[PDB]
Structure formats: C-alpha cells, structure tokens
Nucleic acid binder design. Structure first.
Ligand SMILES: [Mg+2]
Ligand SMILES: [Mg+2]
Ligand SMILES: [Mg+2]
Ligand SMILES: [Mg+2]
Ligand SMILES: [Mg+2]
Ligand SMILES: [Mg+2]
Lengths: 93, 274, 113, 64, 348, 113
RNA sequence: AUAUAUUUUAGUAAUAGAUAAAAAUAUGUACAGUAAAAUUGUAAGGAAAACAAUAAUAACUUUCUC
RNA sequence: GAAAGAAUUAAAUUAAUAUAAUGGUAUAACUGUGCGAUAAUUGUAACACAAACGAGUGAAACAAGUACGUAAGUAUGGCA
C-alpha cells in the first residue's frame, strides 16, 4: 500500500573521514525588472537570467515610485479611457 | 556486569584532561573542521555576503538609534519563585514554578552597541503530508529544498502516531534545513526580490506572527515555490512541488525588534501589531 | 524492477547524494600548508579588527545619544519626552533597498508619490 | 515450542561441547568460547542440522 | 620589514633550509616544494591556485603587526611583559611556525628551535599542554602517585626520563610504563624542559625518585623509599639533560638504588619528582642548600616533610612502575642487596 | 465471590552491618533496591546493589562533600580513621600478605610463574 | 568533421556527524550528551500531524581593541 | 569594550529504563556513537546475607583464556 524505495545496506562513513557536501554551483547573473544586475550562486546551469516580475517593479516594494495578448491582436482594427467612459453607465447594478 | 552504580571519582589536580587527545584512534578527527588537514574542511568565507554587508553599514546603526530608550533598566522575566520560609516543610522544597507560565522566561535587556538585533538563523521546515502514502514524495521535497537553498537538507520523520490522519510513527515525511551565515542571507535576498513579489495577493508577513522572543515565521504554498529560479528554470523536471514553513530566528530581545530588523531587509508587514 | 517515477526519484536522490560525485582530498605540502595557515590567520585577525572598529563606532554612537538625551532632559522636558517614545511598530522604508551587485538603468528617482 | 535447545560442539576436536537455547528459525549460531581440554578459546558450531528462516542476503554491490 | 632583519633578532627565527625559504618567498608559483623529495611526486603535485599573492599580503600584514609590537617591546622594562610582547610579535611569523612544527622539540637543535628564544619556548609549552602534559596528569591520577606521595602537581616543566646505561637501546619512557629489572638496573637520565621565564643562572633544581609501594610488615601497610636523590642541579633551556656529565658527586643526596620488587609484593610505582629551589634576593650566583644526610633516610622517606623542610615547589613529574621478574635477584646480587623476600600469592 | 489473597514475602533489605562494626572481606554491609547508599572507601557493590566489604576494617556511614546528596558506606582500616578521609592525604592501604619465612614454601613460590 | 579499434565512464540509491529522545542489534567495552511537559508562533494544519523558539554570566583562559 | 572557549550555577530523573509495581538512575543505570560480538567463557570459590532441611542471594581472591580501552582498568549476561 505504502509506496517506497527499499533501502540497500548503508555505506559506513568512518569517524574523521566524513566530508562536507559542497554541491556544484555556478555564478548566475540575475537582471531584475530594471537593469540592476545581481550575482548569485545557483545549482542550475544558467549563467544569465533576466526577471520580469520582481520587487523592483511591484507596487508594494516601491509605493512612492497570453489571452489578453490574443484579444489585443484580434481586436486591433477597432482599437477597443474613452472607451471605458462610453461603456460604463453605473445606474443598473 | 557486577553492578550498575555510576560514581565519578574525584581527582587531585586542576589540569583539564582532554581524553580524545590521549588516544591514537581518530587522527583526522583531532583536527578542527576549520583546519585544512581535516577531511571535514570547507571554504567558509568564499565571497562577500551582500545582505550582511548592508546590515553592517546602514541598518545596525539605525536599529540602535531606534531601540535607545533613556535610562532603560533590565526587565526580569518570569522565573521560578522560592518559598518563604514560614514553615519547616519549605526547607528542601523545590521552588514554585513561574507565575503565569510553567517554564521560565528570559530577561529582556536594554539594546546597546553589543546586543543590537540581527539575523541568527533560517530554518525551512517542509513536512509533506501525502508522504504518509508515498515515501518518494519526501525525497522530492528534500531535493526541492536543496535546490532552493544550496544547502544539505535533513529528513523529517513522523515522531507521533494518530489514526484520524493516516499517519504512522517513524516514517520519512518531507525535510528541513537550517541555513546560517551567507547561504541564509542569499536565501532571504531571493525571497525578498524574486519570490514574494510574484505571489499575487501578498500583503506581507503578519504582525501577530512570531515567538515572544526574537523569532518570526511564515509559509509558502506549492504555488509559491515555482517562482524560485532553480525550480522555475526546469518546470518539466518539477511536476510536483511542496509548500514550506520558514522560521526566521533573530538575535532580538523581543518580537517587534525582530520585525523591525526584517523590515530593514525589505520584508513587508501588514497585520495589526500586538 | 522500477517504474519511470521510481527512476526519476532515484535520479533526484543522486543529485543530493555524495555517491561517486566528490573529488580526492585536498592534500598540501608542508610549506603550502604553512602558507595557507598564514593566509587564514591574517584574514581572521583582519576580520576581528573590522568587528572591533564597527563595535567601537556603535559604542561611540550610543555614548553620543546618551549625552544628547541627558542634555535634552535638562533643557526642554517636552522635547525629551517627544524624543523618548516607544518605536515599537517602526518600519524601515521600502525605498531603502539592499544594495545590488550592479546599479539599475535609472540610478535615482527625482520625483515621487 | 518457540525456543529450542541446541548442542554447540567444539571445533578443536576435543569432544567438549556447550549447549545453548535459540529461537526455532534463528541463524546458525557459532560462538568462540573456552575449550578446557585444549585450554584456549576455540570456535563452537552446531553439531546437528536444522531449518533456518531464510533472510535475503543484503547486496552491497549495487544491482541493476 | 622586521622579519627579514637579523641584527638584533636571533638566527633561529629564520628557516635554516634555503630551498624551503625560497619556495615560501617567490613572486610566482613556478618552483616545486622541497618537502616532496621524489621527482615523479613533485610532477604529480599541484598547489592550490592564487596562493602566492595572498600569502605575500598576509605576510606583509603580520610583518607590520610584528613591527608595531616591537615598537612597544623595546620600551618595556619588566621582563615577563617584554617576553610576552616578543611572543606576540613573532608567533605569527611563518618561518618560526615552520621551524617549530616540522622539526623535533624533544632533542631540539639550537639553530632550528632555540628554547632561549621566548616565542619558541611558548610554542613548546603549548605543544606540551596539547598532549604530553595531559597524559602525564592522567598517569599520575590513575596510578595514584599524587596523593600517595605528594598532594598535587601544577605541571610547569616537561620531564622525560631514559635508561641509556643498562641495556643499550634508546627510548624515552612513556609515563606509567612497565620496565624490566634489566632495563632499570643502572640509573636513568632526566630531561627537565622548562617553559616559564626563569633565571637560568640562579635557579637550581632537585630531582627525587620515590617508591611509595615497598611493603612494611610491622605497620601491615607500605612505606616510601627514596631510590634516587639529586640536589642543586643547574638547567638551561637548551642544555637540560641531567646526566653524570653534569651533576657532581656532591649533588647526589642518595645515589641510585634500582627497582627490586619482591615476588607477590605487587606492582611498584616509581614516580620521579622535579622541584625548583627557593630563589634568594640580594645574592649574586646560585644559592646552594645543605641537606642533613643523617636526618633523611632511604628505607623510609617522608617526601612531603622533606619538601616542607627545604621549601621546594614540585614543577614536574614522571613515573614508571616495576614488578617482580627473574632478573631482580641478579640485579640485587650485582648491587650487593640481600636475597630479597617472597610473599604469599594470596592477599589474605 | 473473588478475593485478592496473594502477596510476596518481605525482601530482607535493611542494613546488615552497622556503624563502628568490625567487618571481614566479602561481608555484606547493606542489602537494598537501588543505591540508597553508595559504595564508599574500601567497599564494593554487587548486582543487587549490595554493598560489601573489600577489606577487613570498621564499617562507617558518611557523607562526602565531593558527592553531595549521596549517602556512603565505607570501611575504615582502623577505628582511628574518620572515613570520609582527607582528600590530599595519602590513601591508607593494607598490604594484606605475609612473607614466606619457611624456606621450602618460598622456593615453591619463586618457582611458580 | 567523420570511420574503425582499444579503453574509460554511466548499474545513477539516501548516513558526510563520534550522529545524541523518529524508527532500527535488548549482552561487552571505550567516548560523548540530555530528556519531558507547557507556552508563543508558522503553508494545507484544526484539541490532536512537523519545525522553530522559551533560566542566570559573577569570576577564569585565549583572541582583537579603546 | 567586544568575540570565542572553558564552563559554573539554578532546574530536572515529571521523559527514558525489554515488561508489572516499588526502590534507584543526569556522577546517569537514560540516550547517541567507534570497536566489538567478547565475559550470555573454563577449574577452585572463602566470607557474608538469608535460612528447619531442600534450596535461594551478594561475592573478595587464586588459576586458564578472551574483548574493548592511550592508560587506569572494566566485562563470569541484562539498574535491581
Ligand atoms: Mg513486599
Ligand atoms: Mg533494563
Ligand atoms: Mg520509578
Ligand atoms: Mg541472619
Ligand atoms: Mg543452609
Ligand atoms: Mg546495561
């Protein structure tokens, strides 16, 4: 019933011979929402990443400062604000 | 065995005999783990920690300035009360337990140049409850944790037994990892910048959250973990994903000080404070 | 023997495990060992010095604050009272961000709110 | 009968033998004890034959 | 650059090996380590990268620190403080570290490890505290050589004994060893290595080997026995091996009588104690002391009383322990001691 | 009816030898369940925590400052000794053997190895 | 860049610490350590799963420093 | 003035002890770990406790051999 991986005999690490787990890590450059780059050590092999949604473009972190895309594409000739004002009578609710 | 009577004999000298050194059994183990000759050696101070540097430069002075209360004396905690000797039965009696609590509470000191609050340790407890059925889920959770941290996780086992929740005793179920120093700092920085902003309706950490003494916590859902760059870069490799608790341990005397410190490192706080 | 899921779990386990992934031990010559020791000791000393400098600075700041607050108490009681308030829910501003490795495109924002 | 008796016969062929008790399907019980005929510690082994609860021999060589 | 200067500073602070020194101080990692003697092994070897420039920077940093310390050290007048300053200055010197770590401390060659130099002496003390001292303390406590002879010990000098004259073999005795009667037939040789700052010219020493476990059948207990007693011995940090060469016949308050344990009397502890003399002011030269040779007895010997009389302070100790064997009778015969008693196997 | 008519006998577990009492080697000074009394000077302890005398002497009950909150039973080798003995004084020991004045016996003993 | 031959790797599996109150070898010996409850919190978690935190530093030694 | 160490004090035996109940146990007898798997060995056992006898219990010491421990030593099954 319980799904498991059944254990083999464990390998005897002798006292003194235990070595610390130094995992393989690459120096990875993260460019945030704006052009601020930051280096971080990372286990996945990718020298450069650029981020879209970060603290540097979130309103909570700076208060002082593709369905939608598809819709935009196929209702482009009409150009869909003025449109909002036209189609927003707040009597009926 | 002729007897079970344990009784350490007194000595006639003040030299402290380290018994480990007198043996020739574990020659690699006589070296400190910091020493290069030990197999346990690891390069510790590999690069300049950024969050720590920031804390040192900007925040620590600001925190000290905030926490200055003029001629603030020590506030003693709840302690074990002694008996008044108004009866001969008080004479070898154990002390009365503390007033409200059963356990003793620590003294709250005034903040000075020495005891300014700072980050002490992060612990990332992930207990996957579906792993009562599937042991492999615990392994996957541990891997995820390792990926996130760059630090070796430790397996959590079911310490208790209960029938209502289908839970046995002594069953591997998720994992934990205590981050300290530079890796912890990095993890915090990632949380602040990458992950927590990608959470949709994220107000912040609750102000009602925390220990009574310098410890604050919160948790991430399985939805939130896919924003970590190590997990995000291979969504094919990560079909399942597990939530986690994140216990931040500060060197703060009280919890409001700890909250203030965390705010200094760009953690938002939303709820009504105690 | 094993399922694809089981295989993938094993692979994941291996990623974390030290089984046949770790190099030989870092052996040194005696001269090299000494050089290493001298590097480490010096570094440690430097770090201690830096800590003392920072600690000393903090102590100096604390002393200055104490000196100020006594003076304030002596002169204007209301001002002293205003200064010495509980700053329990004090929050660092979200603009004071943790300095990155390299700077952004727009270094400084001149307009706000 | 849960616990049976057995005869451990000395390996140094003195004739000396010591008797001990074991569970019915316990592993073969060999032990090193003093043989007074030879005046030394020698191996003792089970003189009779009996069935054993067959455990799977745990493989250190990583199979498959 | 204070550590390159050797005008006022001793020669021992430098590395005497030229090749090693060259390897330590080069501008690039071009040369190969003198420690690796074999060509193939040298070829195989690869030192860790960037190590040179950083090492040089570390040297400069610690050299500067040493120089700064020296600025204080010369202004200081009182001797212990000055010594401490000197230690602080030179302890982080790579060359002195190399010298100390990788060459023998027991039979130190003066040019490599000079115990006249304060830093080296401090290093030697630290080394002793790390292992040998602890071991000695354990052997004193476990065997019960402290309370049985002399209440306590505060180990200051490292004391090592040897029995060169009896057999021929070279071996420093590990504390609490079982030595044969052949081994301990003729006298031992002491080496009292002193690590504290002490007046080498004035300070005298006494050495007493005592046997607490010789049986007294009147008392139905044991009595002590002064097996070997020397007084007024002169030590020097480097010149410290107490041999028939050094001490004169006047120094011998009780000349070596060998361990001759009786059959079934049991194991007999022989615990050498090393005391330093009381130092008298306003008197140039070594202050001697006279021992009343009729007063002190060898067949029964109050060690504590003796110490009280002459105002001694036990700085060091060492211990072996002998029991009966076939050759003890032969040893007795050689020394002209009587046949030797034989006790009942049962302690009834 | 059903009655609870069943019980073990008393285990004779008092002190079997008293303060100031002469003892011999092997003799039981205390029978007990767990160390109510700890084995002191010149005294052993058995499987059943039974204190027994290792030497001939005088049974003494005492406290030792080294072990506060622990009662001790030891055996002083004479009546003169206060059996919480002075720490830094030398241990009062018994030789407990006799020399073989008889020549033949001595010779036999020498022979025996 | 590609072909053949000869090898080498990949059997991917957990402990990395003298591990220390999940479960497992219940007798020896050597070395080392301290539990529990209750309380305050924290993703699903709820009275009840896991993880964190919760008595006092006078004196002493070493290190850095005014 | 700071960091690190050694630790000490207070509390605790309410957990835990293969198993009842009681006594004992942090100096741990509880727990972890290395080695081991030997002492869950062989002949004599005085002397005690208990005790009608039959039995029962603790056990120094002597001799043979073994395991661990740097050593001191410890182990003749299990805290009782
Ligand atoms: Mg009863
Ligand atoms: Mg038990
Ligand atoms: Mg109980
Ligand atoms: Mg009776
Ligand atoms: Mg009878
Ligand atoms: Mg046991």
């Amino acid at each position: 019933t319980r799904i498991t991986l059944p254990r083999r005999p464990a390998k005897k690490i002798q006292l003194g011979k235990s070595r610390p787990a130094i995992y393989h890590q690459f120096n990875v450059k993260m460019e945030l929402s704006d052009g601020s780059v930051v280096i971080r050590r990372s286990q996945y092999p990718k020298g450069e990443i650029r981020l879209i949604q970060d603290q540097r473009n979130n309103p909570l972190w700076n208060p002082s400062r593709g369905s939608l895309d598809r819709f935009n594409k196929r209702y482009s000739s009409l150009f869909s604000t003025v449109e909002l004002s036209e189609e927003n009578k707040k009597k009926t609710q | 065995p002729k007897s079970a009577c344990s009784l350490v004999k007194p000595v006639h000298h003040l030299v402290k005999i380290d018994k480990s050194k007198l043996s020739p059994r574990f020659p690699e183990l006589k070296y400190d783990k910091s020493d290069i000759r030990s197999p346990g050696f690891k390069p510790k101070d590999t690069h300049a920690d950024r969050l720590n540097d920031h804390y040192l430069n900007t925040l620590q002075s600001d925190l000290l300035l905030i926490n200055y209360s003029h001629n603030a004396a020590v506030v003693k905690g709840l302690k074990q009360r002694a008996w008044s000797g108004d009866s001969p039965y008080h004479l070898n009696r154990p002390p009365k337990n503390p007033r409200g609590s059963k356990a003793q509470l620590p003294d709250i000191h005034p903040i000075k140049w020495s005891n300014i609050p700072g980050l002490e340790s992060v612990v990332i407890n992930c207990f996957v409850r579906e792993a009562r059925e599937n042991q492999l889920l615990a392994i996957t959770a541990a891997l995820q944790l390792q990926q996130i941290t760059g630090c070796k996780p430790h397996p959590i086992f079911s310490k208790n037994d209960v029938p209502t929740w289908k839970l046995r005793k002594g069953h591997q179920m998720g994992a934990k990892v205590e981050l300290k120093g530079k890796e912890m700092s990095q993890f915090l920085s990632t949380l602040t910048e990458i992950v927590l902003p990608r959470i949709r309706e994220y107000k912040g950490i609750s102000n009602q959250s925390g220990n009574r003494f310098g410890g604050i916590s919160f948790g991430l859902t399985a939805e939130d973990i896919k924003f970590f760059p190590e997990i995000d870069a291979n969504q094919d490799s990560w079909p399942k994903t597990f939530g986690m608790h994140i216990n931040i341990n500060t060197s703060a005397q009280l919890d409001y000080q700890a909250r203030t410190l965390l705010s200094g490192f760009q953690f938002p706080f939303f709820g009504e404070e105690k | 023997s094993l399922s694809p899921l089981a295989q993938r779990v094993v692979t994941q386990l291996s990623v974390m495990s030290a089984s046949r992934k770790q190099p030989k031990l870092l052996k040194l010559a005696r001269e090299d060992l000494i050089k290493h020791q001298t590097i480490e000791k010096c570094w440690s000393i430097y770090q201690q010095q830096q800590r003392e400098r920072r600690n000393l600075q903090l102590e100096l700041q604390y002393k200055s604050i104490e000196r100020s607050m006594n003076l304030l108490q002596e002169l204007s009681p209301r001002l002293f009272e205003a200064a010495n308030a509980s700053e329990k829910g004090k929050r660092f501003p979200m603009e004071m961000k943790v300095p990155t490795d390299f700077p952004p495109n727009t270094l400084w924002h001149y307009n706000f709110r | 009968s849960k616990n049976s008796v057995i005869k451990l016969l000395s390996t140094a062929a003195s004739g000396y033998s010591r008797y001990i008790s074991i569970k019915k399907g316990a592993p073969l019980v060999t032990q090193v004890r003093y043989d007074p005929v030879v005046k030394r510690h020698v191996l003792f082994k089970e003189a009779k034959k009996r069935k054993v609860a067959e455990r799977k021999p745990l493989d250190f060589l990583r199979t498959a | 650059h204070i550590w390159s200067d050797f005008t006022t500073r001793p020669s021992s602070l430098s590395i005497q090996s030229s090749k090693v020194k060259n390897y330590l101080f080069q501008k690039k990692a071009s040369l190969d380590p003198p420690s690796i003697s074999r060509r193939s092994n040298r070829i195989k070897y690869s030192p860790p990268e960037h190590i040179d420039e950083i090492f040089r920077m570390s040297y400069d940093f610690l050299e500067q620190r040493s120089s700064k310390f020296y600025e204080l050290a010369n202004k200081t007048k009182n001797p212990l403080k000055k010594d401490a300053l000197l230690i602080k200055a030179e302890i982080n010197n790579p060359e002195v570290q190399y010298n100390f770590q990788f060459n023998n401390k027991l039979n130190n060659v003066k040019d490599i490890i000079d115990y006249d130099v304060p830093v080296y002496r401090h290093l030697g003390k630290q080394h002793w505290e790390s292992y040998g001292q602890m071991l000695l303390m354990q052997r004193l406590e476990t065997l019960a050589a402290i309370p049985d002879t002399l209440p306590t010990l505060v180990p200051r000098a490292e004391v090592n004994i040897k029995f060169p004259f009896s057999t021929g073999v070279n071996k420093w005795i590990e504390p609490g060893e079982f030595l044969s009667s052949n081994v301990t037939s003729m006298r031992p040789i002491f080496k009292i290595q002193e690590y504290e700052l002490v007046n080498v010219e004035k300070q005298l020493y006494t050495v007493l080997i005592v046997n607490p476990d010789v049986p007294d059948l009147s008392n139905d207990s044991f009595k002590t026995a002064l097996c070997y007693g020397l007084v007024n011995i002169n030590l020097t940090y480097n010149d410290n091996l107490i041999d028939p060469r050094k001490f004169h016949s006047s120094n011998i308050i009780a000349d070596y009588l060998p361990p001759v344990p009786e059959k079934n009397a049991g194991k007999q502890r022989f615990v050498v104690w090393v005391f330093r003399q009381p130092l008298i002011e306003d008197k140039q030269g070594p202050n001697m002391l006279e021992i009343d040779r009729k007063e002190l007895s060898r067949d029964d010997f109050d060690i504590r009383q003796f110490t009280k009389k002459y105002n001694l302070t036990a700085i060091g100790a060492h211990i072996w322990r002998s029991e009966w064997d076939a050759k003890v009778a032969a040893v007795r015969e050689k020394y002209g001691l009587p046949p030797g008693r034989v006790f009942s196997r049962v302690r009834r | 009816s059903r009655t609870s008519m069943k019980d073990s006998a008393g285990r004779r577990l008092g002190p079997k030898k008293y303060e100031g009492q002469d003892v011999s080697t092997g003799e039981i000074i205390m029978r007990q369940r767990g160390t109510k009394f700890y084995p002191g000077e010149n005294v052993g302890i058995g499987k059943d925590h039974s204190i027994f005398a290792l030497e001939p002497g005088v049974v003494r009950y005492y406290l030792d400052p080294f072990h506060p909150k622990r009662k001790f039973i030891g055996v002083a080798l004479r009546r003169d000794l206060k059996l919480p003995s002075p720490h830094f004084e030398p241990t009062v020991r018994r030789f407990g053997r006799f020399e073989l004045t008889n020549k033949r016996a001595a010779y036999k003993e020498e022979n025996s190895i």
